[PDB]
Ligand binder design. Structure first.
Ligand SMILES: CC[C@@H](C)c1cc2c(n(-c3ccc(=O)n(CC(=O)O)c3)c1=O)CN(C(=O)OCCOC)CC2
Length: 326
């Protein structure tokens, strides 16, 4: 049967019925073919591979993508020659053609492993890992000292918020109030209404357990302190909105390098986490993707079952894990 190869660090976006999968890498390391676009039909469980043309982005891991009215947008990532800040569009409504957009304004620094919130005409990007910004811009950047000893170009984490306005394809940075979360990468973002949630991620020697939201109307940051038991700190997890009041969390990697198979729901109205029982306790995943379907399910694809930092033993997956959340 038509089935995409195993991979981690790919993107997966959806319209609630079809899930589009692109990029990523695997071992036996190499990037998956840049021209392939895999489409999973969430209702039938079948895959279809299509070959794209146009301004095909380079093969990358850690890119950040969205699907808005069946138009896919892709930002950033890491290819064979490093990080990028290029922005692409792929209209999937109707051979599919990638379009690299010449954006106006100052783009974000080249980076990967970030997150995005969609709010009306705006794509709002947050955080990531990559090069030192070419100029001192709004926000903070912290170097990863380990990147000076094993590479020609040092990298670090940022807490930057950038808006790509789809009305004009212009980059800008909002002036925020409140305490932004620390710089981080491999955090997870989820949007509900005008609230852009962000949970966890890596910063310095920690994989974090903090939860915040940015008000996408006022640009005010808020820290959420749920009472009672909270999930363990992690990076490379997924956080997916499943209703107007619930975010679904799955997998990830702890500070002490444990791959995770726990799942939880964060109830926004109660400001509480509820652990979610599921049949995949023996299928931990990190750097997988998750997409919510119109039928209340969360579809998880790819990612790695163990510590992918030991490249020769990494267990990249091509499994679809289906969570019946709502
Ligand atoms: C994109 C290539 C990928 C396989 C990759 C490889 C390596 C690293 N990151 C990174 C870089 C930044 C970052 O925030 N995270 C997320 C996270 O750590 O949760 C992973 C990669 O993303 C970071 N490293 C690392 O953590 O080494 C262990 C500690 O060393 C004292 C060193 C090898």
């Amino acid at each position: 049967l038509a089935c995409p190869a195993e991979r981690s660090g790919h993107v997966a976006v959806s319209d609630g019925r079809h899930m589009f999968v692109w990029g990523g890498y695997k071992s036996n390391d190499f990037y998956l073919p840049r021209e392939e676009l895999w489409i999973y039909n969430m209702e039938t469980g079948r895959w279809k591979k299509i070959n794209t043309e146009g301004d095909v982005p380079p093969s990358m891991s850690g890119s950040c993508a969205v699907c808005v009215d069946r138009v896919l947008y892709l930002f950033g990532g890491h290819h064979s020659r490093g990080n990028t800040n290029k922005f692409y569009m792929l209209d999937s409504r109707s051979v599919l053609q990638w379009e690299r957009i010449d954006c106006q304004g100052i783009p974000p620094s080249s980076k990967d492993k970030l997150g995005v919130w969609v709010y009306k005409n705006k794509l709002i990007f947050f955080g990531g890992y990559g090069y030192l910004p070419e100029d001192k811009v709004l926000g903070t950047f912290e170097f990863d000292e380990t990147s000076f000893w094993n590479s020609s170009h040092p990298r670090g984490w940022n807490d930057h918020v950038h808006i790509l306005d789809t009305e004009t394809f212009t980059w800008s940075q909002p002036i925020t109030t409140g305490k932004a979360p620390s710089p981080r990468a491999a955090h997870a973002c989820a949007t509900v209404g005008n609230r852009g949630f962000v949970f966890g991620g890596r910063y310095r020697d920690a994989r974090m357990n903090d939860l915040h939201y940015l008000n996408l109307d006022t640009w005010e940051w808020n820290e959420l302190i749920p009472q009672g038991i909270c999930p363990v700190g992690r990076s490379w997890h997924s956080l997916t909105p499943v209703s107007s009041d619930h975010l679904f969390l799955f997998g990830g990697f702890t500070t002490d390098k444990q791959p995770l198979s726990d799942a939880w729901t964060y109830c926004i109205s109660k400001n509480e986490w509820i652990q979610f029982n599921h049949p995949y306790t023996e299928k931990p995943r990190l750097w997988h993707t998750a997409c919510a379907s119109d039928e209340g399910e969360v579809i998880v694809f790819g990612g790695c079952a163990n510590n992918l930092l030991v490249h020769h033993r990494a267990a990249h997956s091509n499994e679809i894990l289906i969570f019946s959340v709502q």
